[PDB]
Write a protein that binds this ligand. Structure first.
Ligand SMILES: Nc1ncnc2c1ncn2[C@@H]1O[C@H](COP(=O)(O)OP(=O)(O)O)[C@@H](O)[C@H]1O
Ligand SMILES: Nc1ncnc2c1ncn2[C@@H]1O[C@H](COP(=O)(O)OP(=O)(O)O)[C@@H](O)[C@H]1O
Ligand code: BEF
Ligand code: BEF
Ligand SMILES: [Mg+2]
Ligand SMILES: [Mg+2]
Lengths: 572, 572
């Protein structure tokens, strides 16, 4: 990220910066002409008396005071309304581009980092670019009103004052280019300190079962002391700067004296060579500010926003473009010679030449020895990850060709460890849908057998299950995750191992009777119990990522194909 | 939180502040005396030849310039250092008091709120305090100088200049009591929009299975447009305080003319009356800054830190004070007429008069109908929540009387949904322990039947399982959550649902063998499968929070007690 780019996100704020600059000029006139009009007013009363021409002249002293404060106020009241509008736009423009990246991206960036860039960084970058544009607009007017006088007093001497500027910028640039490399290693070393404060608070019930809850507060400290060594290095590099300029503004302050002598004796007056200094002390208090800091800050902002400007430009490595949304779907899924391997461990192949299909209207189970690729057959059916070789078909057309917002409304899912949100229940069984009538939420909460325990909570369908449904039992959090996938009435239904993983051994049956036997679905039951997969219309045993057997329970329990060995210890 | 409290947290910086103030005094002295010596040197060099006589006077100008530059640089450096130190101290002192609160606390405050608070509020408070202290010191020095110069001219008029200061303060106190009530409803409405950006990023694999990943980015926006409506009322005020001040500083400039002229025609030189204004213009620019902003800011800091100063003073409602660490623990647990009720739903009793015990060296199981209180018998045994009637005894003495860091080293636990951390595996099977030898991590990873699949990962025991072990299968995250509980040799082991959860029924046994049959443990197997509790030395069936049956498998399958009805559907 260069300096031009950072100033591009402030383009829609020109209508505000001009009205903020104009009201800045008017604030300068009233600050200079005031004395000239004051004496002109004091002489009036001094001529004869007051109350006769005083009011005639004292008026122009009031209007300037009033006419001034209005400007100095309406200005400060807009450079605080452009630090917000620039913030809200830098924040929103990141999220909206941080929530459309392929899923393989959230496995490499810990959710503590991604929030330290959205919360902290975009607050810094917004801050710097406000002040340093609040200043460079003030010091570009004072330098003008003070530069014209340094000519009226001297035509020669002024041309020497302007020989330091090109010097006070070669220095104000050497730090701008070093203050960036640093203010990026502080926003970074400050995020790594905010991924240990989020990983320890979100898991406080498992960091306390072990007694090191007060020792995980000394791994946070030792993460700040590394954001300190980066702060006592950002001071020594700002002290060392003030000296770098101050010295330079001295040489120009001396050389102006000696060369100011030759004139004072021969050419220039002695009264002028003294006033051209007072008016000269300002161009130093400006040549060091106007372009000393305004170009360091603008180079410390571009440092803080060096990463925030990378998540906004990153191109998702899996783009979904297709609008094949039909109106009559059968529900026939097929895996045609699949081959898969994750992006965070690319030396092991998860699936290999897997090939099977689900028939429309039948409960095709899927089993395996707890380490084969079973869920990975769900993280693909739902187009989370890309394939190396092969294609998944849904009714004859590869899933890549369906409308990304429609495919996920005809393929429900019950992930292995269901994750609920911190809302009500009636607002959690209808998560993805716009305003479904409260009638269909109950008609779909009796199928999953939730209405039994929901109508006993302190508040019924309006209770709360906060922070990943951690305020519901392990068995109630599924029957509320089941109902969340049935209220859509989906043709294809996917029940991952959370089907009945944590039920009472009598509840999982009262669901099977109603899940797909009554209506027409295409279920896909992944599980380890022999009960659930007993009556399945089919079974696909896969081991180490290779489909082995495809046969019904008895038709497969006859021959020994690694299936009859699994259910052995369970048949008692 | 008053202002004295906010300032108290900067007590250990008195040394730095006195050093900064001293260097500020020096810088002011230099900047004020420079022109007089400059004129002296110019006169001394113009009187005679300046070639050799100039230096004897320009040396003083050079020394004053060098001194001023050094002072300004050191002041800037020390203020940046003080800001950094204050920020670090506040940050650290928040966490260390935010990770020792009772567990119920973390069930009422969402983990996005806490992190937004910590980060943003600490940054804002430190920034405000630093800027404001700096400005106040500078302005007090300048005001002292100018007030001396003003008294030197008039003894009467000055006493009218100060008649406005109390006015410009009573006004700078009404935008310090309204600007606090506001800057607290911005930090408390900007952290309510950083819990919708953390709840959506940490659950990105379940907010995408439903297609509303780009509609969850328009619930974030509408959470910012309410931080705007506040950031606007915060501008329309600052723009309405400069006016309330600028005006008051006008009446003082008018009233200083009427009384200013009356003295110029009778007893005050007209030359002086003109000069007592220029010096007067640069007190309005200070009486409006020195106490204008420096007392609004200090009242906006106390606003932003209105909550951060509440998590630092909150008293944990469950304090553990007991040191009874023995050297020979038997391992006998007992529940003596327990009665329990959560604090976030205090109208339903979870447990009721529960009473049972675990015998030292026996696998006491525990079962129920998926909604009774079973885990709540573990969130109590580990002293997470307080009881209401009854005691939980560990070897005769209540658990409340054990070293909180020792009790949790003799009672291991396997939560219902295990949660791993984003580290290696050899650094995750030894979480709570300091540097256990790598020989004991393998000897304890073969018991849990994990060494089989660990030595096939791309990197072996050094691979990574990031962000809640989401980069391991559902059945590999259990066998790594067991090894984490067995590497301590706990005399009391608790398996909420670890083996039965997601194991393939083959490695399901190899754990069931070596866990407690070889050594001396006191296991407690919670589960739903008939396999675990089949060979258990005891069973305790509890329903709706009331222990019903306490008998072995056969001794309990004889009499129908809601047990024979549970395992019925699975006995095949
Ligand atoms: N997000 C992921 N990134 C990398 N590897 C993964 C990820 N999820 C699972 N794996 C690996 O894939 C293999 C098979 O995983 P998975 O298909 O989930 O097994 P199961 O379906 O039995 O849970 C496992 O060895 C696991 O280490
Ligand atoms: N943290 C919590 N806060 C409030 N209520 C809870 C919490 N955890 C569980 N519950 C409630 O307690 C009841 C019993 O929960 P629990 O004992 O966990 O059941 P199980 O042991 O079968 O999972 C449930 O109805 C559940 O709603
Ligand atoms: F390891 Be699994 F999700 F059966
Ligand atoms: F509802 Be549970 F944890 F058996
Ligand atoms: Mg799975
Ligand atoms: Mg439980």
């Amino acid at each position: 990220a260069t300096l031009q780019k950072l100033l591009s996100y402030t383009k829609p704020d020109v209508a505000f910066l001009v009205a903020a600059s104009f009201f800045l000029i008017v604030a300068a006139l009233g600050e200079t002409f005031l004395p000239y009009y004051t004496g002109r007013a004091i002489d009036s009363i001094v001529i004869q008396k007051s109350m006769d021409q005083f009011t005639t002249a004292v008026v122009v002293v009031c209007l300037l005071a009033i006419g001034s404060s209005l400007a100095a106020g309406i200005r400060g009241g807009i450079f605080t309304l452009v630090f917000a509008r620039l913030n809200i736009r830098l924040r929103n423009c990141l999220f909206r581009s941080l929530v459309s990246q392929e899923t393989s991206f959230f496995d490499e960036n810990r959710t503590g980092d991604l929030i330290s860039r959205l919360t902290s960084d975009t607050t810094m970058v917004s801050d710097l670019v406000s002040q340093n544009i609040n200043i460079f607009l003030r010091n570009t007017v004072k330098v003008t009103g003070v530069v014209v006088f340094m000519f009226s007093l001297s035509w020669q001497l002024s041309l020497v004052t302007f020989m330091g500027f090109p010097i006070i910028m070669m220095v104000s640039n050497i730090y701008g280019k070093y203050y960036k490399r640093l203010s990026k290693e502080v926003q970074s070393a400050l995020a790594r300190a905010s991924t240990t404060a989020e990983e320890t608070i979100s898991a406080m019930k498992t960091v306390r079962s072990f007694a090191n809850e007060e020792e995980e507060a000394e791994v946070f400290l030792r993460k700040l002391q590394q954001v300190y060594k980066l702060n006592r290095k950002e001071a020594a590099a700002y002290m060392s700067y003030v000296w770098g300029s101050g010295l330079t503004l001295l040489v120009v302050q001396v050389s102006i004296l000696y060369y100011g002598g030759h004139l004072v004796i021969s050419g220039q007056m002695s009264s002028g060579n003294l006033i051209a200094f007072i008016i000269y002390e300002f161009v130093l208090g400006d040549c060091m500010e106007s372009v000393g800091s305004v170009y360091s800050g603008l180079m410390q902002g571009v440092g803080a926003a060096e990463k925030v400007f990378e998540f906004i430009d990153r191109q998702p490595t899996m783009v979904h473009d297709g609008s094949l949304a039909p109106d009559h779907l059968e529900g026939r899924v097929d895996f045609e010679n699949v081959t898969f391997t994750y992006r965070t461990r690319p030396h092991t192949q998860v699936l290999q030449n897997v090939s099977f299909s689900l028939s429309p209207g039948k409960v095709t189970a899927l089993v395996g020895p707890s380490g084969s690729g079973k869920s990975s057959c769900v993280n693909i059916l739902e187009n989370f990850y890309p394939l190396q070789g092969g294609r998944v078909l849904l009714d004859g057309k590869p899933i890549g060709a369906y409308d990304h917002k429609y495919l996920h409304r005809v393929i429900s899912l019950v992930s292995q460890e269901p994750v609920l949100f911190a809302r009500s229940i009636t607002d959690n069984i209808s998560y993805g849908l716009p305003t479904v009538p409260f009638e269909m939420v109950v008609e779909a909460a009796q199928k999953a057998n939730a209405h039994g325990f929901i109508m006993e909570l302190q508040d019924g369908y309006s209770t709360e299950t906060g922070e990943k449904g951690a305020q519901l039992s392990g068995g109630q959090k599924q029957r509320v995750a089941m109902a969340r996938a049935l209220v859509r009435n989906p043709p294809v239904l996917i029940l991952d191992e959370a089907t009945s993983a944590l039920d009472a051994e009598s509840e999982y049956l009262i669901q099977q009777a109603i899940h797909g036997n009554l209506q027409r679905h295409t279920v896909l039951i992944i599980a380890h119990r022999l009960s659930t997969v007993e009556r399945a219309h089919l079974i696909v045993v896969l081991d180490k990522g290779r489909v082995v057997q495809q046969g019904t329970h008895q038709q497969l329990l006859a021959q020994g194909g690694l299936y009859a060995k699994l259910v052995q210890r369970q048949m008692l």
